[PDB]
């Protein structure tokens, strides 16, 4: 009876050290072709929480379980109870397999129509396995993908607002694909929430990953980065210098429509922008970048209206409409009203003369609110310096250091 | 306040579901709350998040979404006309009118700021109240209006420890 000896060894190895022997034993799987674990599962699972059975779940999910061995509901409930009530510390000893399980869950949810119900599971798994609140794990990518596919961007916000420092190794199973797709999906989530600055940051982080080949995630990140830089700013932001010199010569020719879109955007002519958008409408529709292109079209008008304030103190509605090509005083008035409403511009409308006056005197920097703002900026900078000093001391205490120096 | 705890309760209700889809009343309540807080991105994403079958099953979701499109285009006069087109459920009867009041205040801001002189008809369309709110402008608020031209004129309305922390950080 090999199974009895195996389960006895599993029970004894728990809370007794020698975790390497147990890990090797779970790695020696594939001979458990019998599927009679269903009736014997519900005897020890409740007892002593769930300090085991992660490996058995991993080897159950992958072996030709397309409809989860037609027991999707039961397996989903099993993993729900496992993750909800867990030690957290012992399983942290072997994160790799855990991450794989999460990956399988994603592959079991995004497929047909229902990627939403699993968001709240990887949500707990992320903070159950990760070192600290700022540490990149492969499950972050799966959570971002589930939030993107389910059109539920709010749950992923606390796991995107924090800045990643150090990445979990996952026993060497953390591929660069996880990093690239996590940052790409975070960028798409932020663009969905109109947070274009952080979306641009995420896209730039995805692009600047060192590489020697061409990745479709990287190319889509490049396209969306160009679009977001055209929306938030008036130009394509220059990529950081510390990027791979080979990947930056092949991706650029592929994304030529977006580069010429930026080139015609820099001319401040909405008509040519619309003509060229209609000329490569197929490229944007195929890449599903439509909606961002219309946002660029509207941002061109907004930027023209903003530039009107860099020259004028007071301008007629007809003059503004003729200058920025909205073809109508009423459309220009609505545009300026929306711009003031969002705080993007300081102006007032006088309907008696149909005039717009720009009051470019917002702040005198002499109030306690600016004192608090500078205090918050200083606190962020101080915590940044503290993290840098901690990393420096950690790299100094490392045995390889000093020996090489 | 109590609004924070209520939002926490809705977050709890949304977090777990029998199959990831909750009851239509709570979905409508969440969409109405999203419209109330001007968080329109999450509102539209919730609207597309609803499965098409349950979306077409009930017309209350359709009315809530039509209100959402009306407020998305910033069409202020039509917001009140659309909000009155349908009748809401009893449990949300008094709060939705409160939402209207919120929009009221919003329009007031959009008149107090970004408008030196506003046509009386346009002001009334923005605030929704036909002619009587104009009176509230002069008698109560304190503006100055004039007749025969219909030109409304809106008027525009613990540390030592911190410094010790700064010096301690900089000196080391």
């Amino acid at each position: 009876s090999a199974l009895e000896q195996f389960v006895n060894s599993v029970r004894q190895l728990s809370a007794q050290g020698q975790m390497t022997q147990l890990c090797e034993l779970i790695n020696k799987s594939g001979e458990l072709l019998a599927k009679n674990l269903s009736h014997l599962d519900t005897v020890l699972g409740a007892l002593d929480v769930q300090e085991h059975s992660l490996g058995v779940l991993a080897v159950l999910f992958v072996k030709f379980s397309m409809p989860s061995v037609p027991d999707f509901e039961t397996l989903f409930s099993q993993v729900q109870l496992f993750i909800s009530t867990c030690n957290g510390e012992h399983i942290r000893y072997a994160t790799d397999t855990f991450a794989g399980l999460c990956h399988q869950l994603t592959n079991a949810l995004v497929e047909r129509k229902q990627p939403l119900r699993g968001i709240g599971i990887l949500k707990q798994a992320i903070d159950k396995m990760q070192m600290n609140t700022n540490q990149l794990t492969s499950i972050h990518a799966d959570l971002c993908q589930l939030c993107l596919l389910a059109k539920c961007f709010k749950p992923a916000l606390p796991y995107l607002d924090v800045d990643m420092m150090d990445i979990c190794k996952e026993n060497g199973a953390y591929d660069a694909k996880h990093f690239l797709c996590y940052y790409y999906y975070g960028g798409m989530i932020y663009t969905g929430l109109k947070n274009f600055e952080r979306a641009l940051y995420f896209y730039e982080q995805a692009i600047t990953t060192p590489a020697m080949a061409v990745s479709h995630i990287m190319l889509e990140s490049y396209k969306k980065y160009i679009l977001v830089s055209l929306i938030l700013l008036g130009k394509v932001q220059q990529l950081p210098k510390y990027t791979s010199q080979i990947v930056g010569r092949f991706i650029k020719p592929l994304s030529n429509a977006y580069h010429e879109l930026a080139q015609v955007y820099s001319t401040n002519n909405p008509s040519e922008l619309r003509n060229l958008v209609n000329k490569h409408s197929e490229t944007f529709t195929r890449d599903n970048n439509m909606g961002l292109v219309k946002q660029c079209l509207s941002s061109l008008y907004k930027k023209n209206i903003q530039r009107l304030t860099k020259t004028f103190l007071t301008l007629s509605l007809q003059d503004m409409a003729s200058r920025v090509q909205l073809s109508g005083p009423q459309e220009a008035e609505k545009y300026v009203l929306h711009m003031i409403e969002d705080g993007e511009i300081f102006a007032s409308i006088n309907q008696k003369d149909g005039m717009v006056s720009f009051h470019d005197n917002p702040e005198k920097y002499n109030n306690p609110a600016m004192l608090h703002n500078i205090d918050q900026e200083m606190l962020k900078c101080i915590e940044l310096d503290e993290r840098l000093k901690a990393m420096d001391q950690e790299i100094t205490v490392n045995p390889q250091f000093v020996q090489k120096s | 306040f109590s609004f924070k705890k209520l939002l926490d309760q809705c977050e709890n209700q949304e977090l777990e579901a029998p199959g990831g889809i909750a009851t239509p009343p709570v979905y409508g309540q969440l969409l109405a709350l999203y419209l109330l807080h001007n968080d329109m991105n999450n509102a539209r994403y919730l609207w597309k998040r609803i499965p098409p079958a349950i979306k077409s099953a009930n017309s209350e979701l359709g009315g809530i979404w039509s209100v959402g499109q009306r407020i998305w285009q910033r069409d202020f006069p039509g917001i009140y006309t659309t909000i009155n087109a349908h009748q809401w459920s009893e449990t949300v009867q008094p709060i939705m009118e409160a939402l209207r009041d919120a929009t009221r205040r919003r329009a007031f801001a959009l008149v107090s700021q970004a408008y030196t002189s506003i046509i009386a008809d346009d002001f009334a369309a923005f605030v929704g109240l036909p002619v009587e709110e104009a009176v509230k402008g002069i008698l109560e608020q304190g503006w100055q209006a004039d007749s025969t031209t219909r030109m409304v004129l809106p008027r525009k309305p613990q540390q030592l420890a911190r410094l010790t922390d700064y010096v301690a950080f900089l000196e080391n």
Binding site: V397, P399, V402 | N172
Partner: peptide, 24 residues
């Protein structure tokens, strides 16, 4: 200030300890 000095001296002690054991 005392915490900063203590941390600096502890880091110094650790690095010289690692330097001593690295000279085998």
């Amino acid at each position: 200030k005392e915490n900063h000095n203590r941390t600096q001296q502890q880091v110094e002690a650790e690095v010289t300890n690692i330097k001593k054991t690295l000279k085998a």
